[PDB]
Design a protein around this ligand. Sequence first.
Ligand SMILES: *[C@@H]1O[C@H](CO)[C@@H](O[C@@H]2O[C@H](CO)[C@@H](O[C@@H]3O[C@H](CO[C@H]4O[C@H](CO)[C@@H](O)[C@H](O[C@H]5O[C@H](CO)[C@@H](O)[C@H](O)[C@@H]5O)[C@@H]4O)[C@@H](O)[C@H](O[C@H]4O[C@H](CO)[C@@H](O)[C@H](O)[C@@H]4O)[C@@H]3O)[C@H](O)[C@H]2NC(C)=O)[C@H](O)[C@H]1NC(C)=O
Ligand code: TMP
Ligand code: NAG
Ligand code: NAG
Ligand code: CA
Ligand code: ZN
Ligand code: ZN
Length: 706
Amino acid sequence: KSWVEETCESIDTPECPAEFESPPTLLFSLDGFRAEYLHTWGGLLPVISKLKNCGTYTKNMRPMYPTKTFPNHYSIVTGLYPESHGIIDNKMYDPKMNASFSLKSKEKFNPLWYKGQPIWVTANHQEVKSGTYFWPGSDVEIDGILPDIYKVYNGSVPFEERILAVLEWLQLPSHERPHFYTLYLEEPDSSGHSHGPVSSEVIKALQKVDRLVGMLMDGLKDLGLDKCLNLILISDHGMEQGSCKKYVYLNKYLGDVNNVKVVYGPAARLRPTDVPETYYSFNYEALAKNLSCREPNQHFRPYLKPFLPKRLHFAKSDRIEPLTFYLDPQWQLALNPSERKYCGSGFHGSDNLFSNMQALFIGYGPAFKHGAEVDSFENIEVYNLMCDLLGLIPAPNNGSHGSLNHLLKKPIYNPSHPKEEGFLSQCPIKSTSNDLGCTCDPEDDDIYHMTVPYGRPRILLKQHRVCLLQQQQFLTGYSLDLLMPLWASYTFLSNDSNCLYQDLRIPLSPVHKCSYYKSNSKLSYGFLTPPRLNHIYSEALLTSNIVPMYQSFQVIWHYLHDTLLQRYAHERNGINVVSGPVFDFDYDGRYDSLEILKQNSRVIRSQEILIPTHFFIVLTSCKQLSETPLECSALESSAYILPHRPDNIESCTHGKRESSWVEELLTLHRARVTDVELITGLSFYQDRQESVSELLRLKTHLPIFS
Ligand SMILES: *[C@@H]1O[C@H](CO)[C@@H](O[C@@H]2O[C@H](CO)[C@@H](O[C@@H]3O[C@H](CO[C@H]4O[C@H](CO)[C@@H](O)[C@H](O[C@H]5O[C@H](CO)[C@@H](O)[C@H](O)[C@@H]5O)[C@@H]4O)[C@@H](O)[C@H](O[C@H]4O[C@H](CO)[C@@H](O)[C@H](O)[C@@H]4O)[C@@H]3O)[C@H](O)[C@H]2NC(C)=O)[C@H](O)[C@H]1NC(C)=O
Ligand SMILES: Cc1cn([C@H]2C[C@H](O)[C@@H](COP(=O)(O)O)O2)c(=O)[nH]c1=O
Ligand SMILES: *[C@@H]1O[C@H](CO)[C@@H](O)[C@H](O)[C@H]1NC(C)=O
Ligand SMILES: *[C@@H]1O[C@H](CO)[C@@H](O)[C@H](O)[C@H]1NC(C)=O
Ligand SMILES: [Ca+2]
Ligand SMILES: [Zn+2]
Ligand SMILES: [Zn+2]
């Protein structure tokens, strides 16, 4: 009986043959295996289905951006964001090197492109042999290291021969046998492009790939290793149906110009032709502004590199072009109809939160649980997973180590919460009492737990000076070094102008006076906690609850609290809110140091002001709608990192449909709670009853579009 014909068997303890001390780990990749494939065509894939039912499976695995083979395949083995490991796209360009990059190029084998530290290199430093077969980055030597058994990519090699090559390696002597293995197949990406996600060729391709995995499992069984191997069946991205009617050509707005170069696709980038002479000299801002809101329902959007949604993490690299494009699902962009390969073919590269861009993940073996279906996770989390499977100390990556502990039978690493680095001080009444120049028209322990019911945010900033200012409706962490609130937390239950009051607990700043704000300047102040809470709540009008905010952004901030927040309180039976300013001027996704903070402080209206680049807001509710936010058994988080812009050009307000475009901006800039943590230097939910590993799972979560 073949392996697919046998039923499920619990592998609680690894049954390994002699000469084996611990089960090896094989990384099997199927390029272009969209997550929807297994959802729909499970009955046509008997081998893959058995791996799902007897292993750890996830409906959707979120890949990196853009959704291309090389960036993702390399992000898997490095656990790094594409913006940090260097491989941004299949085709790209580095100004500092004056060189282009391509799969079919001599530059592909150039080690100056590959950053970070792939798993086989990590394994090499800790004395673990690795035998790879066609994995991106395996051909090139990184940090002067090559896998003990490697193969320069040759797509002509038959699939059946690739499996046998690895099966032959498993028989090598105990001292010369690799402990980590890789396998790569071009299907169903190839059939997906040429015929589309819904075709007879993809069904035939899925079945072809399915029998091939079955060949491996029968081969493993004949070697007596079917219960002695950790298998990770993964893919790089999904597949979307492209259309000729749904394609954008830049020439229609610019003309047949030759001063600009466009990298076509759903994730388009633009660079000037005179490069690197005008790579920075070219002002993209004018071109970006000249391309926004030209159509009634434009299916693409011009983005300066830092203005992209933070969840994408696609800015802090030289190779990423300063002008990018965000496109609607099923839409691609190009300069001229001649540059593109084809318009009505299966494509990928769209937003990584899109439904059809989702990837595959199946963990099978003695180390993985049997028939356990888990929630979605990013592929950068997989790097740490392999280190635990190979017994390696992981290189510094972007994945939250331990967040995938629920996949393993016996977890290797037990994570802990980050210690508080902030210099926590207290603010008594010390400075009374300045004139604010405002016109106004006519115990403690119980109130604390009510405002921060999951525990106060811990200050990970080193070594920032923060005071905890307690009020009757909210608790705010105030910064003494910046003289403005870092965060303000309050609980809003299901059913419950030009004036301000000086908070005598904080030192007075000239920007706290209403006299500082004129009706002509676009810059004003906003509240972190809505004053319309619970008559009218006056403590929300404290000086310590205001932040510098553009007038154009106040349109989004007020509607967010006056309309949406109240609707969410009815749907989710109350919500707990934590809000605050975000300062990331170097657009790297992490909080800025005091040094770079002082460099970006503009002076306006004769006073020095540090103005926020973004505003974060975290909404927390109960998973059970019968419970209020003060008595949750399980949490329901949703974070947002909203861009603080002087105008609303991104939204195309023109047509004036306000209730629509605001929510579309909110949904687009949704982010992981971890993303908010990374960019603000705060740590949430530390006093929460669930374990650290569970909380990591919660904070790294993002919802899938459509
Ligand atoms: C995802 O995860 C990745 C990896 O974990 C994160 O990426 C990391 O980001 C940090 C900071 O953003 C990087 O550290 C910085 O490295 C740069 C560049 O280093 C080189 O650049 C210079 C060449 O011109 C040179 O100055 C450096 O030389 C030495 O510098 C110091 C001097 O003492 C020395 O200690 C180093 O060993 C170097 O030999 C070097 O050649 C550097 O500019 C940064 O310095 C800043 O911080 C330091 C203090 O650490 C400070 O002294 C400086 O003033 C400056 O402010 C810093 O070292 C790191 O390299 C990245 N890791 C990798 C491998 O990519 C990423 O942040 C995560 N992303 C998200 C969104 O979470
Ligand atoms: C793994 C690998 C794939 N390729 C090719 C084969 C795939 O068909 C192609 C991926 O297409 P894609 O990026 O659009 O998904 O890249 C290389 O050129 N070199 C390599 O090392
Ligand atoms: C950059 O490279 C191109 C071709 O590789 C070359 O024509 C050009 O002269 C180079 N420019 C500089 C400044 O080296
Ligand atoms: C690629 O692989 C095939 C099959 O092994 C082989 O016949 C061919 O010669 C190889 N091509 C290259 C580039 O060596
Ligand atoms: Ca920063
Ligand atoms: Zn691919
Ligand atoms: Zn492809």
